[PDB]
Amino acid sequence: ARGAATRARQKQRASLETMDKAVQRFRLQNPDLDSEALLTLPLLQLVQKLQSGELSPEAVFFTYLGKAWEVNKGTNCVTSYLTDCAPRQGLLYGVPVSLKECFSYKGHDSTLGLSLNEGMPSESDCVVVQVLKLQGAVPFVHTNVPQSMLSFDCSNPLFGQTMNPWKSSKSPGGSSGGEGALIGSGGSPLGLGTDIGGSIRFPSAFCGICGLKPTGNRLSKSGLKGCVYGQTAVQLSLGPMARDVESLALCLKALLCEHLFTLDPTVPPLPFREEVYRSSRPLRVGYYETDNYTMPSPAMRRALIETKQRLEAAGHTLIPFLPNNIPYALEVLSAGGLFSDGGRSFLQNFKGDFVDPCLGDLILILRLPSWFKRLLSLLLKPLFPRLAAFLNSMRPRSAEKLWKLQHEIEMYRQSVIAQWKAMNLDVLLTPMLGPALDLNTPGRATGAISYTVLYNCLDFPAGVVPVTTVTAEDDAQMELYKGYFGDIWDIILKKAMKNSVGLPVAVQCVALPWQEELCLRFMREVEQLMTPQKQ
Amino acid sequence: ARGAATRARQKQRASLETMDKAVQRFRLQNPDLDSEALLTLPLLQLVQKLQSGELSPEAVFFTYLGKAWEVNKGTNCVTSYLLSQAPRQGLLYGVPVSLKECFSYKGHDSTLGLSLNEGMPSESDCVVVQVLKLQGAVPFVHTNVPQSMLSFDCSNPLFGQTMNPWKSSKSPGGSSGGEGALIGSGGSPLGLGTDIGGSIRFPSAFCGICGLKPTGNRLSKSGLKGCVYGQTAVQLSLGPMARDVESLALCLKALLCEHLFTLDPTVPPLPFREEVYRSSRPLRVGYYETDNYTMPSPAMRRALIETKQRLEAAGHTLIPFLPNNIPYALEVLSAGGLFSDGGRSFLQNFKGDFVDPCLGDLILILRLPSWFKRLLSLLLKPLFPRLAAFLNSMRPRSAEKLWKLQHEIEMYRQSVIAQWKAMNLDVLLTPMLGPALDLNTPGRATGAISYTVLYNCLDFPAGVVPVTTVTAEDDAQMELYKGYFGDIWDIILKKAMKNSVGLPVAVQCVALPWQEELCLRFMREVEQLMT
């Protein structure tokens, strides 16, 4: 019954064949076109060459479609080709954009990896896909995701496994893994992903690209496919992914227009504040080296310290700052928010389906009765506190206890804001989980989402920018990596981040709610100082 | 134990005595001041006379404090009494503002009517009180609320009963009743209320004043006292109340500033779009005469039709429009959203306290076990569907079922929006519940919230503007008033809205989320054409 994942596979195979035929019918027509020079152009220079008319939309489309087919052979990131494909005045006139599979597209599946969603095409484009087209953009591919989107790896029994473009044995991150892999190899100049616990930021950091997770309701979620609906405690956000920060900013400016506010009027009509983004006044930057929960890799720690020091040398003031009660925010707020019903609604999608090994024991753990969930919890507590706390907050609750939780989240949000205001911060610098874990390990290193999921729970703009790569000295010091807890998550993380020389390491930039243009201004500073030659 | 509501009453009495002493010490100092001419000034002319310096902030403060004490004697709306630093550059430089009790104020109680909150003063001002002060405003009084704020009447065992400034036997509306009563008699030029199911709109309509319920998160809720926290399905909103629409607009402009967005950055930094509010282009106005749930009073029906006709004569295009599945939105979405836990958290506030008669049987009904709630429900179903549906939706749920409900609310919101867009509307004209029910009746006419609670559930900006007054022709036709259901709610509403000649009747104006300046532009049109 779920064995008919072959139906999805032959569909994926047909998409790839259509791509290959289209690119080669174009390659024969334009033998004098310079592909190498075209692909290595930054999106800013690309769009103004489209807007002037120095490049045709056809040229840039099939050249990128060409690379996409080529990079897919080594990464397996493209699930289907959006076959049915522009307003001249648009800010993204000729730009091909890749989409995470959960972004619904007319006549195409959003099979989150589940057999349950297989023969179910979308009747309509989702709001963001509509505004992309209205702004000139050409959405061309659906990119791969882990089986339920609840994994920072990228594998499912339908379309298979996505691999990191830098190292085959490594994960591309998740859940926007296909996106990270494709943009990371230069197969796409821009892409859209979603993030409920780091799903834009993991793939960005692991594949060495830029990503932004805006405030939850800055962009429209109208028409996004998910496994569970109506969970509003931990905020889901969608945002851009690109090779540099200027591309993220241009994408946001394009999305934040009259078209987006007219379609789906539940989005606050906040235009892209150009004067904030283009600002160059010195910033008060809060920073932390470790969240005292997941121990940073020597690669992470070096990346964070060096970016801090360059910011100081630039003239910014750097202030030690750490959000209060992080263990609380993850173990009870975030874990309990995402699994208030004990995962009963989540488990509905898996009925009669295969469970991809990249999910670990999540499905097995969630299927346990509440009393057994509790019994194991206080049994593990003395030796393994983290495991016990997570087990306990993944139990079913009454609506009364959901209200208590939702109130606790808004209280925590205000307490961190009060903390932020007292220290008088503009932005916040955070370590980002990296280099990138081994192919099937993220599913058993859940604690590692600590650096990211915090700001979904807080609902703050959070962005990621690659600043350095793992040196052989960094990888050697992974041998003396001991966790804070020494539990199974620390053990697996130790062996998963090893054998990782040359892989990109990123840093995380945070701002207050609704301040994404300030967040981008800060991400631009980090990019400018750490990769001083990128344009 | 709850008997020490005398403690609250002697505190209220001391506040009143402090006011009286302050007013009289000022009146002796300024015997040549014209109080009558000062009080009858609209807020716009009042503020620009402050801003120029033709009036001192002292003059306008104690003149309004004076009226407040006077109108309180007949209305019982002031629960406690709250210049030398008032910032000159502020848009509300000298303006006295009245506050609903739930707005926390340093060193003062927010006893929502409950004994449980008696000896518990606030350690801090709430965000909106801070921004009012920073804008120059002077919050001067806390105004009365019904016992749990879950009533569109206005009575509690601590501070007593608030009465309508137009007719003593009538309710001022709720839960911002004290507010409505005070502004309705000219005791305050501006006030702040909250609205989770019509609690800005009821008191505004009942007392003949303007009110606006913005989109839930347009303003800050940071520091508001409530009975239940963390309920996010049906949206709570705070907004201004005033004698005209221009005062509402001026208040919003003042609140929507850098101070509000710096304190509580969870509020989207949307400044007051002046070009939308000051616009005078013709509007596509959707309208309905009845929600097919609560039958309009002849006074309501006449008010709606007349406003419709004047808008047409003005040059606006008027389109029949009614949100789909209203019975569903109230009985299952709104009722279930407010009572997902069966009212267990709500009932916590009442432990060992008196239950004010204005609450009706709410407390008794919510205290019943879930199985009995169910048993009564399908037993009532054949004869009284409304009562059955409400009873059933006020039962405890799992978190799983709350997720299903919250998903259904966002689905419904999108389906009404789709309805709105297809018809290509700018704004929506709706009947507003009125003239104003008898003193202890709102608590047993729950279905009457249908016209308001819908837009809390939808989370749309919704405003109220008085357009007419009940004629004796209208009051006579209440004898031929038969409901849609004929149940206890229709019976009580029939008797409750009668004997009501001369009372103000309002109309309701709605716009899409985040469009409160368009909503106010529409409210200004109705006010301009009807008054």
Ligand SMILES: *C(=O)N1CCN(c2nc(-c3ccccc3)ns2)CC1
């Ligand atoms: C992308 O948005 N994400 C967020 C979800 N993230 C993961 N979350 C978990 C998890 C498991 C149990 C309790 C809380 C959180 N595992 S992976 C995947 C990437």
Ligand SMILES: *C(=O)N1CCN(c2nc(-c3ccccc3)ns2)CC1
């Ligand atoms: C002001 O916003 N409010 C809220 C609406 N409110 C009332 N709600 C009810 C009620 C009772 C049972 C089930 C649903 C709703 N009665 S009055 C007036 C004060």
